[PDB]
Amino acid sequence: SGAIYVGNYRVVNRHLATHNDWANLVWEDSSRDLLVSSTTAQGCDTIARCDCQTGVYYCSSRRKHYPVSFSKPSLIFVEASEYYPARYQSHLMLAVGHSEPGDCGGILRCQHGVVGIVSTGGNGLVGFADVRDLLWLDE
Ligand SMILES: NC(=O)[C@H]1CCCN(C(=O)[C@@H]2CCNc3[nH]ncc32)C1
Ligand SMILES: [Zn+2]
């Protein structure tokens, strides 16, 4: 679990969105595994606006942060799960690292701010849904 709170928005993995998230829906994209809902309380996370390929992510299944090198956002094949059929997930970045189901939502950060959130795992890889292209999150 985990979310990004920036301005009047809450960013979460679409497969983990709640009833309240869907009742206050702003934007969702099944191909990216992202959903943004509106909030009443103001958020203070900073979104990175960059092309960094190194950062640190929080891994809840180890209660640790790990430094990683990660790929640029791209369409990557993701195995079928109970939430989606087998498909290409877009705007996904992979790194070598630990990620098990409950790790989704863990933030990936570089020196400039929030880069994205954990969205996939398995086979010793961790995939992060990028949020750096969502320029409207700040306006
Ligand atoms: N974005 C998606 O389609 C994800 C939907 C939930 C299931 N997915 C996974 O990869 C999980 C997530 C955490 N890591 C992990 N390690 N082994 C399996 C898994 C795919
Ligand atoms: Zn950066």
UniProtKB/Swiss-Prot annotation:
Record's catalysed reaction(s): Selective cleavage of Tyr-|-Gly bond in the picornavirus polyprotein
Binding site for Zn(2+) 1: C50, C52, C110, H112
Coverage span on the entire protein: 869 to 1007 of 2193
Organism of this sequence: Coxsackievirus A16 (strain G-10)
Subunit structure: Homodimer.
List of catalytic residues: H15 (for protease 2a activity), D33 (for protease 2a activity), C104 (for protease 2a activity)
Role description: Cysteine protease that cleaves viral polyprotein and specific host proteins. It is responsible for the autocatalytic cleavage between the P1 and P2 regions, which is the first cleavage occurring in the polyprotein. Also cleaves the host translation initiation factor EIF4G1, in order to shut down the capped cellular mRNA translation. Inhibits the host nucleus-cytoplasm protein and RNA trafficking by cleaving host members of the nuclear pores. Counteracts stress granule formation probably by antagonizing its assembly or promoting its dissassembly.
Protein name in UniProt: Protease 2A
